[PDB]
Amino acid sequence: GKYKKGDDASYFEPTGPYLMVNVTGVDGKGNELLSPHYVEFPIKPGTTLTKEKIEYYVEWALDATAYKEFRVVELDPSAKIEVTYYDKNKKKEETKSFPITEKGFVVPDLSEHIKNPGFNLITKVVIEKK
Amino acid sequence: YKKGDDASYFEPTGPYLMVNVTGVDGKGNELLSPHYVEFPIKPGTTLTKEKIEYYVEWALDATAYKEFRVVELDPSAKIEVTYYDKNKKKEETKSFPITEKGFVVPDLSEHIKNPGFNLITKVVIEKK
C-alpha cells in the first residue's frame, strides 16, 4: 500500500486480550479529519484503564496514521469500551460495556469463554496539532 | 510478575528512571520548581525523545499542572547513570543523549540491581 497500517504489528490474530481502537478524529466545528484505522494494543486483566490512559492509547493510535503529530483534545464523553463474546454456559452472545471515567474500571478476565477477547473503543475525538 | 504498580515508598529494587523537572512557560517564567518522580524501567527498552516527553508529562500529573502538555524539551538534556564498577573499584558515569532514535537501556546487573537513570531538564509546558 501507500501507507500500510502495521509496521510490524502481528500478522496473525492476537493470542490474548487486546484493546481495539477505532476512532474518528474531528475538529471543533464538527468536520471529520481522520477515518477510523484499526489498531491493537495488548492488555492484561487486572489492569485499571482510566480516562487518562485511554486518552494516551488513542494518541498512540494516531501515531499509526498520517496524523501522528496530533494530540487528543477531548474524547467524546459518551464513549464506552464494549466487549462481545459467546458465553459457553448460557450459550448466548453477551456484551459488556464499561464507561470511560476518571477512576476507571478493571479489565475483567473472560478467558473462560475466549482467549483473546477484543475490548472495543469506537468514538469520536476532537484532536489538534502539537 | 513484572516491575511493580503504584511504586514503592522505599527505594526501588529494579532499574528506574528519576525525573527531575523544571516547568517553564513559553517565556521561561518558572511554573514548577524541580519536581521529582520515579518510574520503573526495564533494561532492553529503547528510550526515545518522544518516550521521554511522555514520561515528563506523566511526571506533571502529580502537580498543579497535570492538565498541561509538554511542548518542548530542553535540547541539552541527557540521561546519566552513576554506579560503582565492581571490577574497577571506582565510580563510573555513562551519558545517553536524548535523540529521536534513542538508546537502549543497558543492563548494569553485574554492578548494581537498582540503578537510577537520572533525567534533569527544563521543559516548556502549556495548558491542553
Dihedral sign for Cα atoms in the order A111, A113, A115, A120: negative
> Of the CATH numbers 3.10.580.10, 3.40.30.10, 3.90.1150.10, 3.10.20.130, which one belongs to the domain with range B1-128?
3.10.20.130
**Torsion angle defined by CA atoms of residues B37, B42, B47 and B53, in that order, rounded to the nearest 10 degrees:** -30
Sign of CA dihedral A27, A57, A113, A16: positive
B68: which 3 cell numbers?
A: 498541561
* Angle, alpha carbons A63-B67-A78 (nearest 5°): 70
CATH 3.10.20.130 fits A1-130, yes or no: yes
Nearest CA among A31, A96, A18 for reference residue A57? A18
Contacts (Cβ under 8 Å, ≥6 apart) of B45: B104, B105
Which chain A residue has its CA at the smallest distance from B128's CA? A73
- The conformation of residue B34, written as its DSSP 8-state character, comes to E
The Cα–Cα gap between A119 and B70 comes to 29
Q: How far apart are CA B121 and CA B128, in angstroms?
A: 21
What Å resolution does this PDB entry report? 2.3
CB contact under 8 A, B54 and A52: no
Asked whether the beta carbons of B79 and B15 are under 8 A apart, the reply is no
Min distance A12 CA to chain B CA atoms (Å): 24
CB atoms within 10 A of CB A105: 14
Residue type, A112: E
Spatial distance between the Cα atoms of A2 and A15, rounded to a whole number of angstroms? 28
Closest CA to B114 of B8, B6, B1: B8
| Grid coordinates given for B114 | 537498582
* Number of Cβ within a 10 Å radius of residue A35: 10
* Overall size of chain B counted in residues: 128
Place of cell 520548581: B33
Solved with? X-ray
Q: Which residues of B touch A56 (CB under 8 A)?
A: 54
Q: Report chain B residues whose CB lies below 8 A from the CB of A44.
A: none
Residue with the three cell numbers 518558572: B30
Q: Which uninterrupted H or E stretch holds A53? A: helix A51-62
Chain A residues within an 8 Å CB radius of B61: 52
Domain ranges of chain B: 1-128
d(CA B32, CA B22): 6
* Pair A100, A53: CB distance under 8 Å: no
Quote the minimal CA–CA distance from A93 to chain B in Å: 33
The CA distance from A59 to A70, in Å, is 7
- DSSP code of residue A26: E
